Ligand binder design. Sequence first.
Ligand SMILES: *[C@@H]1O[C@H](CO)[C@@H](O[C@@H]2O[C@H](CO)[C@@H](O[C@@H]3O[C@H](CO[C@H]4O[C@H](CO)[C@@H](O)[C@H](O)[C@@H]4O)[C@@H](O)[C@H](O[C@H]4O[C@H](CO)[C@@H](O)[C@H](O)[C@@H]4O)[C@@H]3O)[C@H](O)[C@H]2NC(C)=O)[C@H](O)[C@H]1NC(C)=O
Ligand SMILES: *[C@@H]1O[C@H](CO[C@@H]2O[C@@H](C)[C@@H](O)[C@@H](O)[C@@H]2O)[C@@H](O[C@@H]2O[C@H](CO)[C@@H](O)[C@H](O)[C@H]2NC(C)=O)[C@H](O)[C@H]1NC(C)=O
Ligand SMILES: *[C@@H]1O[C@H](CO[C@@H]2O[C@@H](C)[C@@H](O)[C@@H](O)[C@@H]2O)[C@@H](O[C@@H]2O[C@H](CO)[C@@H](O)[C@H](O)[C@H]2NC(C)=O)[C@H](O)[C@H]1NC(C)=O
Ligand SMILES: *[C@@H]1O[C@H](CO)[C@@H](O[C@@H]2O[C@H](CO)[C@@H](O)[C@H](O)[C@H]2NC(C)=O)[C@H](O)[C@H]1NC(C)=O
Ligand SMILES: C[N+](C)(C)CCOP(=O)(O)O
Ligand SMILES: [Zn+2]
Ligand SMILES: [Zn+2]
Length: 426
Amino acid sequence: HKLVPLAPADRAPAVGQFWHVTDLHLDPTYHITDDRTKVCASSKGANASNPGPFGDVLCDSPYQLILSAFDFIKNSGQEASFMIWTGDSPPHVPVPELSTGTVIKVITNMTMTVQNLFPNLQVFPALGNHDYWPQDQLPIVTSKVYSAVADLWKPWLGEEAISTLKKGGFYSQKVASNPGLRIISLNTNLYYGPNIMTLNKTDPANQFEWLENTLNSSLWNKEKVYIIAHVPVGYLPYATDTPAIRQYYNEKLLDIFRRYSSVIAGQFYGHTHRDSLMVLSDKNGNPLNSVFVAPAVTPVKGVLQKETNNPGVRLFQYKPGDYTLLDMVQYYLNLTEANLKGESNWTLEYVLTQAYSVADLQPKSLYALVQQFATKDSKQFLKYYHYYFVSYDSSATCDQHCKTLQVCAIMNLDSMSYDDCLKQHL
Ligand SMILES: *[C@@H]1O[C@H](CO)[C@@H](O[C@@H]2O[C@H](CO)[C@@H](O[C@@H]3O[C@H](CO[C@H]4O[C@H](CO)[C@@H](O)[C@H](O)[C@@H]4O)[C@@H](O)[C@H](O[C@H]4O[C@H](CO)[C@@H](O)[C@H](O)[C@@H]4O)[C@@H]3O)[C@H](O)[C@H]2NC(C)=O)[C@H](O)[C@H]1NC(C)=O
Ligand SMILES: *[C@@H]1O[C@H](CO[C@@H]2O[C@@H](C)[C@@H](O)[C@@H](O)[C@@H]2O)[C@@H](O[C@@H]2O[C@H](CO)[C@@H](O)[C@H](O)[C@H]2NC(C)=O)[C@H](O)[C@H]1NC(C)=O
Ligand SMILES: *[C@@H]1O[C@H](CO[C@@H]2O[C@@H](C)[C@@H](O)[C@@H](O)[C@@H]2O)[C@@H](O[C@@H]2O[C@H](CO)[C@@H](O)[C@H](O)[C@H]2NC(C)=O)[C@H](O)[C@H]1NC(C)=O
Ligand SMILES: *[C@@H]1O[C@H](CO)[C@@H](O[C@@H]2O[C@H](CO)[C@@H](O)[C@H](O)[C@H]2NC(C)=O)[C@H](O)[C@H]1NC(C)=O
Ligand SMILES: C[N+](C)(C)CCOP(=O)(O)O
Ligand SMILES: [Zn+2]
Ligand SMILES: [Zn+2]
């Protein structure tokens, strides 16, 4: 007779879950035709290799492929309280074949697709470098694209997020279904090498100042933060000594993340179209923060490349009310199989804790895994290299130089530690 909240039965609180999808790269031109140089504009005159209804390795995504990915999510039976979506919706075609209006039209199509299929799901998007015309030229002041995506994403974001999105293409947002969790969606395309608009700027769009203030507020308000962005921090795992964003920005952003590692419970990136891990550590090798690079839905590659990825989407599990990451489930589409029979079978690729026999996704757990990778002929690393391409090629091999680059980039996000790793292991 005193209106006290009803106590839940002391069962185990189910884990929380969220989806991460990235790099959809819709090619609206995709159509099967006898002249394989006309299957898709994204192959740029090359012959599609073996095209089917769900795509080709030399093409960006048919609409049917993207629809199959989101249909899989919708029908998966997995509960999820939100989704993160880290950008890159238009296809890889020459600048004159696009325009601002065409870019906005593709992002609108992808946004409405998600909203139609998932009417009750809060989605946290970030912009990719292709989400602007010309590609990679994302500005440091408001623009038509920023204003358009701010309008498109209003169903998911509050007024303050909309206002920063419109001005600079970034925002933070409290997660409605998850009190105490805030998403910080950065515009790391401001730091991407090809961006002429940010050359020699110390703090383009004031994003560093805003990020520091946001994290400081989260720290004092006892929030936890998930960082999402398109281009990741750290070093390319397939090239030597090449930061993914300009070195000046990589060093500055990493220093902010080290300072606020106690608040940041996850970092989630796209852009590479590969499945990669990184572990941010301090200068002495003590692990601080776990980083998860998710592979793309598009399978596209250039003619020059030997390997590509199968389409992928992924699910994270986390501790409710606490937001510590517990697991990651990677799903994929075997594109060759799907095209041969004409029917998609999105399926489990792996569960991280089971694949690698780790307890959870905390920095110390993953740091110990990466130390295993470093051992000669590590079977853990062989598995990881297979998953890097989302199981595209079980016979792909990683020679000594290849592996040094991979492991050094997983373990060492800043220039000093990365170069020291090269010194010791080249
Ligand atoms: C996604 O789905 C695709 C399609 O089903 C799978 O790809 C097929 O995988 C099978 C088995 O792994 C392949 O069949 C095997 O091919 C081997 C030779 O492979 C090389 O040469 C072929 C030549 O056509 C290339 O296509 C290929 O890329 C390789 O470079 C053979 O050695 C195998 O023969 C053995 O099989 C049995 C017993 O093992 C016996 O009958 C044989 O005598 C011999 O012992 C076998 O034929 C098949 O070629 C692949 N198809 C395609 C189109 O690539 C992927 O595995 C799947 N992905 C995942 C992650 O599961
Ligand atoms: C794109 O492919 C066409 C077709 O190539 C043929 O078809 C494939 C299935 C494979 O069997 C190839 O070895 C074949 O040659 C290419 O056009 C052909 O190229 C040569 C040189 O001109 C000639 O023998 C054919 O007559 C050409 N045309 C046709 C209709 O066969 C074309 O060169 C390829 N384009 C690119 C950019 O690679
Ligand atoms: C980081 O934040 C602290 C705390 O600021 C407060 O945080 C919230 C309660 C919010 O209500 C803000 O308005 C508050 O100001 C900053 O330290 C405070 O501000 C100055 C620091 O020189 C000092 O006079 C206050 O006493 C500090 N308050 C407390 C509780 O310690 C700190 O400076 C911020 N850092 C940056 C870089 O912004
Ligand atoms: C997103 O774009 C796709 C096509 O790129 C749309 O799907 C097609 O829509 C037109 C009809 O208007 C036709 O080509 C087909 O009927 C549809 N399917 C395919 C595979 O092309 C889709 O409707 C768009 N969605 C939104 C929300 O704009
Ligand atoms: C640049 N890349 C080809 C290595 C990765 C893909 O990047 P993006 O062109 O989709 O932005
Ligand atoms: Zn991309
Ligand atoms: Zn990109």
